[PDB]
């Protein structure tokens, strides 16, 4: 599977995680999980 490992994300652009893998911002900024 393709992999993201966006190195950051974050609540105003969550579309460093697009439609593979999802962040979770905390608080602002956040990490990246790929969940497959």
């Given at each position: 599977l393709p992999r993201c490992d966006s190195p950051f994300c974050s609540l105003f652009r969550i579309?460093?995680?697009?439609?593979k893998c999802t962040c979770v911002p905390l608080p602002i900024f956040g990490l990246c999980v790929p969940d497959v």
């Open positions: 579309g460093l995680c697009g439609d």
